[PDB]
Design a protein around this motif. Structure first.
Motif, PDB file in Angstrom:
ATOM      1  N   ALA D  81     -53.040  95.909 -24.366  1.00 56.43           N
ATOM      2  CA  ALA D  81     -52.159  94.844 -24.834  1.00 56.43           C
ATOM      3  C   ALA D  81     -52.933  93.744 -25.553  1.00 56.43           C
ATOM      4  O   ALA D  81     -52.470  93.216 -26.569  1.00 56.43           O
ATOM      5  N   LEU D  84     -54.106  94.927 -28.740  1.00 58.74           N
ATOM      6  CA  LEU D  84     -52.892  95.118 -29.522  1.00 58.74           C
ATOM      7  C   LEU D  84     -52.471  93.815 -30.191  1.00 58.74           C
ATOM      8  O   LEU D  84     -52.248  93.775 -31.406  1.00 58.74           O
ATOM      9  N   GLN D  85     -52.373  92.736 -29.407  1.00 59.49           N
ATOM     10  CA  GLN D  85     -52.121  91.406 -29.955  1.00 59.49           C
ATOM     11  C   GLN D  85     -53.099  91.079 -31.072  1.00 59.49           C
ATOM     12  O   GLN D  85     -52.701  90.666 -32.175  1.00 59.49           O
ATOM     13  N   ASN D  88     -52.315  92.882 -34.155  1.00 63.48           N
ATOM     14  CA  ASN D  88     -51.091  92.449 -34.825  1.00 63.48           C
ATOM     15  C   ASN D  88     -51.251  91.111 -35.520  1.00 63.48           C
ATOM     16  O   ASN D  88     -50.471  90.806 -36.428  1.00 63.48           O
ATOM     17  N   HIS D  89     -52.230  90.299 -35.127  1.00 65.98           N
ATOM     18  CA  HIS D  89     -52.461  89.113 -35.942  1.00 65.98           C
ATOM     19  C   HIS D  89     -53.555  89.314 -36.985  1.00 65.98           C
ATOM     20  O   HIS D  89     -53.506  88.680 -38.045  1.00 65.98           O
TER      21      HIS D  89
END
Lengths: 81, 60, 179, 125
Positions: D81, D84-85, D88-89
């Protein structure tokens, strides 16, 4: 699926007539058209054109509820006679 | 004669009023596949000849 | 990372291309009825990237169309573990303020999920940022289109209204005019 | 109508972004008239997703940064996670990951995350 030993070297007449019918629908929707596309060129006799197929590159698969899938290519066996 | 006996049917659907096909008279002339008639119809010996008769009977 | 989803639906291959090229036609058929609004949860106008297998390609008892089914992978935007993105304020309303991220269209945001003193000024339909920092009443007047780094929690499919809510008021950063 | 498995993916993030660009450029190829009246909204989703992706700093670069963000975090007990964050940024700067972004500082004990910070400064905008 090589469970193809319990059919006489002939398809039955019912199966052959119905596969001619489904080829009729095939060549009657738009075209799977075959060895001669419209060499036999006639008005609205939909059925009587793909009757003259004599090759029929399609597969049909015959069964029994207590049995497996006895498969058959149309090519690999004898015809209505 | 064969002029008092001119009869033919264009289409038969199954209605909603009495929910019937065109049986006998009062809808058209033509056919009526009653008891012995469909008894013969189902007694053919071809699989999807019977399937076609089913699929074209009244409505599907 | 974006979630592939196994899908099993009716495939109606028209007889127009029974002998023509198959695989890309199959993909087009799959994209035919997987549209945006309402097909299933979770599904909205999306596609595949890899094959698994192609099962029974029946025609009919004797009728026209085909009876193919689906073994594929569907690229959905599942609401993940609050993935950090940029959330543009999509609209305004007295009940809540609309936001845009990239997954869905409508993203409801309750009032207090704005900056805690920042309220919805319904006298002008502007969610004016009462940016009450440095003791100042710094009203950051920003209408629809407020810059907020959103990250969202949920997705919806069933109700009368594709609506989301991206949770804001990050304790570690605050400053909802930026986060 | 029916679906069986609703979660069958764990892939490269920026790779998925460029593959969505490829999906965008491939859907528009269906502009021929025969297949025109049937299905077109796939173009709409591809274009809107590409627009929101262009909003993200996740552009201009390759999926090699994905394997960087994996190999530098999964090797130090970071969950999928957190990386993943961070994918995604696609953090613009290094100290972004530490203070402008959170949950990316202590699982590496603020020691080897510096290497990922230098990678971010090197490649990411």
């Amino acid at each position: 699926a090589n469970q193809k030993r319990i059919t006489t070297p002939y398809m039955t007449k019912y199966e052959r007539a119905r596969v001619l019918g489904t080829r009729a629908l095939q060549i009657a929707m738009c075209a799977p058209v075959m060895v001669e596309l419209e060499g036999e060129t006639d008005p609205l006799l939909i059925a009587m054109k793909e009757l003259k197929a004599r090759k029929i590159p399609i597969i049909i698969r015959r069964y029994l509820p207590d049995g497996s899938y006895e498969d058959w290519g149309v090519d690999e066996l004898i015809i209505t006679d | 004669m064969v002029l008092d006996k001119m009869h033919a049917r264009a289409r038969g659907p199954r209605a909603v009023l009495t929910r019937q096909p065109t049986e006998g008279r009062s809808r058209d002339g033509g056919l009526r596949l009653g008891e012995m008639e469909r008894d013969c119809l189902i007694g053919y010996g071809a699989s999807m000849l019977l399937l076609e008769r089913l699929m074209i009977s009244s409505d599907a | 990372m974006f979630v592939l989803v196994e899908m099993v639906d009716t495939v109606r291959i028209p007889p127009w291309q029974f002998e023509r090229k198959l695989n890309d036609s199959i993909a087009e058929e799959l994209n035919k009825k997987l549209a945006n609004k309402v097909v299933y949860n979770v599904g909205l106008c999306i596609c595949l990237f890899d094959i698994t297998k192609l099962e029974d390609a029946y025609v009919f008892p004797g009728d026209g169309a085909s009876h193919t089914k689906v073994h594929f992978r569907c690229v959905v935007f599942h609401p993940f573990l609050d993935e950090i993105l940029i959330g543009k304020i999509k609209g305004c309303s007295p009940e809540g303020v609309h936001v845009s991220l990239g997954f869905f269209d409508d993203i409801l945001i309750p009032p207090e999920s704005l900056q805690q003193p920042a309220k919805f000024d319904e006298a002008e339909q502007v969610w004016v940022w009462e940016y009450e920092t440095e003791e100042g009443a710094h009203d950051l007047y920003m209408d629809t289109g407020e810059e907020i780094r959103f990250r969202v929690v949920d997705e919806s499919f069933v109700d009368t209204s594709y609506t989301l809510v991206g949770s804001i008021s990050e304790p570690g950063l605050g400053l909802l005019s930026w986060w | 109508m029916e679906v069986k498995d609703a979660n069958s993916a764990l892939l490269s993030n920026y790779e998925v972004f460029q593959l969505l660009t490829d999906l965008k450029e491939q859907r528009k190829e269906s502009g021929k008239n025969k297949h025109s009246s049937g299905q077109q909204n796939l173009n709409t989703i591809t274009y809107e997703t590409l627009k929101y992706i262009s909003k993200t700093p996740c552009r201009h670069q390759s999926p090699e940064i994905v394997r960087e963000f994996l190999t530098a975090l999964k090797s130090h007990k970071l969950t999928k996670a957190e990386k993943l964050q961070l994918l995604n940024h696609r953090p613009v700067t290094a100290v972004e990951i530490q203070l402008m972004v959170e949950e990316s500082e202590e699982r590496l004990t603020e020691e080897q995350i510096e290497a990922l910070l230098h990678t971010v400064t090197s490649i990411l905008p």
